[PDB]
Amino acid sequence: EACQFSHVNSRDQCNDYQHWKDEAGKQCKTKKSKGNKDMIVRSFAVLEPCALDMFTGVEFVCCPN
C-alpha cells in the first residue's frame, strides 16, 4: 500500500549519476505491485562509490502515486 523501497548494487554495476537516475527510474517503472499496478520514483540517490564519476550501486524509493 504505502511507498516501497528498492535499490540496485553489484560489483560490476558501475554507472554515472545521471545514468543511474534513468536506470533507477526504469527499475521502478517496469516493476509493479501484486495487483500488476504501477509505481513512480519518490526518492533517488547513489550508494557505493565507483570510478571518478561513477557509483557501484544506487538506492531509490518508489511510490504508488
How was this structure determined? It was done by NMR
Print burial letters for 8-33: b (CB count within 10 Å at least 16), e (below 16). Answer: eeeeebbbeeeebbeebeebbeeeee
CATH number for the domain that contains residue 34: 3.30.1490.140
DSSP characters for 12-61?
S--B-HHHHHHHHHHHHHH---TTS---EEEEEEE-SEETTTEESEEEEE
Q: Return d(Cα 43, Cα 52) in angstroms, integer.
A: 24
> How would you classify residue 21: left for phi > 0, otherwise alpha for psi between -120 and 50, otherwise beta?
alpha
3 close to 63: Cβ distance less than 8 angstroms: yes
For residue 5, the 8-state DSSP code is E
Count the domains in the chain. Answer: 1
* Containing structural domain, residue 37: 1-65
Q: Return d(Cα 63, Cα 3) in angstroms, integer.
A: 4
For residue 63 the three cell numbers come to 511510490
